[PDB]
């Protein structure tokens, strides 16, 4: 009740007070061998609560519609960061950012993205936008148009949290997208969980039959990685390769 | 005398530090030699002085040693460290282990083992999650006595780290880890002699069945060198700076 109010009130000032910060988690080729990108993740550096769990604040941000605004701040921040990195010879090939439903439905999104690209001058293909399937499904016809508007900018699109099973996977073919994520909840079952392993292989084979790139998230063990590599998963991310870390340390570490 | 005055003032402030709860623990993270995964946390003593703020350990720690308070403060740190690990693990923050430096008085303390056994019972952590750090000089001071002490501590299940030709002397002891001092890491990767010295310590240490951790790792270059030559673990500013438990867990584990 009260605790809810503090949170909300805190969140409202947070942006203005520059309390939000980006952390970056590395992504690698399926071997484990080379860096393919960084995923930029929203964090909250609160002066008295410390670093605030995303699970606690993201929801509340979207319970008051601030989420789109912060999202747009984040996209911009990551593009800018990738520019700084690139001109500092830190060779991060691309940055991936999540999009909320509100941002996707925003007519001016895409306009902002062209502006941010122009400002920072980074190549379009160095930006990858990540959507859930549910965002696409609320209105498929509209998704088609909005996506085509984005793809025309030369950027890349990844989709996560999608139905598994031949059909839903197959129907993704109609969208102009580049990447499918394998959810961590299927990866933590690998290699010996029967269903989790079937689903992963299903996602990989289907993605490839659609000409999409596949990235596994939540990769923690060599066992998981093995399974994924031998079934030809394209990219990989998670504890095994590195946690989301501040820009400076990602900068130093991957320099 | 000007240097004596500052010493006197410092020892006055320090005498009541523990009573007043002014000492606090920060943690420095440790990673796999590739620099990617957390392997443990080193607990370090810090002093939050009411007027002087955080005071340099290089300043207050030597004075702690002259006035014979280092052992008592250290026992309190050791307990806190283990309590932080419990707390972490209960809150599913996966810090795999905690490391703690022992002073010479603590080491020679006939109750150390009992004290450690009690702290292990009380916190219920696995003993392999407690790593004790001892400098070479503390071990080699009295070789027979250290054999006795360490054989007992090893029976508790805990790990021991020591903090060239000395390596052979160190093998008579049941030690698990060799911490390579920062002086051997600074010149890397391009100091011609430094690099050969580093490679020999690592290989020699692996041939003696010891895991190796390099300290003072500050650049990617140092890290790729250490990594190419199989250094098992690293720590240093390259990964950030020591910090309070709460921040430490959010940022590096969980």
DSSP string for B134-197: E-HHHHHHSHHHHHHHHHHHHHTT-EEEE--THHHHHTTS---EEEEPTHHHHTTTT-HHHHHH
Contact A241 B35 (CB under 8 A): no
- Cα separation, A42 vs A109, in Å, equals 19
E-state strands within chain B? 23-32, 38-49, 53-54, 98-101, 130-134, 159-162, 177-180, 211-214, 233-234, 243-244
Segments making up each domain of chain B, as ranges:
1-254
Nearest beta carbon to residue A241 from set B36, B250, B252: B36
Q: Which of B221, B243, B223 is nearest to B234 (CA)?
A: B223
- Please classify residue A135 by burial: count the beta carbons closer than 10 Å to its beta carbon, then call 0-12 exposed, 13-18 middle and 19+ buried: buried
Q: How was this structure determined?
A: X-ray
Task: Report resolution (Å) to 1 decimal.
Answer: 2.3
> Is residue B97 a contact partner of residue B120, using CB atoms and an 8 Å limit?
no
Q: Which of A148, A168, A165 is nearest to A157 (CA)?
A: A148
Residue B165 is encoded by which pair of tokens?
């030709």
> Is residue A172 a contact partner of residue A159, using CB atoms and an 8 Å limit?
yes
Our separate counts of H helices and E strands in chain B read 13, 10
Assigned CATH topology for domain A1-255: TIM Barrel (3.20.20)
> Is residue A212 a contact partner of residue A177, using CB atoms and an 8 Å limit?
yes
**What residues of A are in contact with residue B246 (Cβ under 8 Å)?**
50
Contact B220 A255 (CB under 8 A): yes
- Cα separation, A137 vs A140, in Å, equals 5
* Contacting residues for B66 by C-beta, under 8 A, at least 6 apart: B11
Do the bridges between strand A245-246 and strand A20-29 make them parallel or antiparallel, or are there none, so unpaired?
antiparallel
Strand-pairing partners, residue A156, are: A128
Assigned CATH topology for domain B1-254: TIM Barrel (3.20.20)
E-state strands within A30-112? 35-46, 50-52, 95-98
Secondary structure class of A182 (helix, strand, coil)? strand
- Cα separation, B129 vs B123, in Å, equals 11
Contact B37 A252 (CB under 8 A): no
Secondary structure class of B129 (helix, strand, coil)? helix
């Amino acid at each position: 009740a009260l605790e809810r109010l503090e949170l909300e009130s805190d969140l409202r000032r947070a942006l203005e007070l520059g309390e939000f910060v980006l952390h970056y988690q590395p992504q690698f080729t399926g071997d484990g061998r080379r860096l393919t990108g960084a995923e930029a993740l929203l964090r909250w550096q609160h002066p008295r609560r410390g670093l605030v769990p995303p699970s606690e604040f993201i929801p509340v941000l979207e319970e008051i519609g601030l989420v789109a605004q912060v999202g747009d701040w984040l996209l911009a921040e990551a593009c800018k960061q990738l520019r700084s990195w690139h001109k500092a010879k830190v060779r991060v090939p691309k940055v991936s950012v999540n999009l909320s439903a509100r941002q996707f439905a925003d007519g001016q999104l895409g306009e902002r993205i062209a502006a941010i690209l122009y400002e920072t001058g980074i190549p379009p293909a160095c930006l990858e936008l990540e959507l859930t399937e549910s965002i696409l499904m609320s209105d498929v016809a509209e998704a088609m148009q909005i996506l085509s508007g984005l793809k025309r900018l030369g950027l890349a699109i990844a989709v996560d949290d999608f139905g598994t099973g031949y059909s839903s996977l197959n129907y993704l073919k109609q969208f102009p997208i580049d990447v499918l994520k394998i959810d961590r909840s299927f990866v933590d079952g690998l290699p010996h969980g029967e269903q989790d392993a079937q689903i992963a292989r299903a996602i990989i084979a289907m993605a490839h039959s659609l000409n999409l790139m596949v990235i596994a998230e939540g990769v923690e063990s060599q066992a998981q990685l093995d399974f994924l590599r031998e079934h030809g998963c394209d990219e990989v991310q998670g504890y095994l390769f590195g946690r989301p870390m501040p820009a400076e340390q990602f900068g130093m570490l991957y320099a």
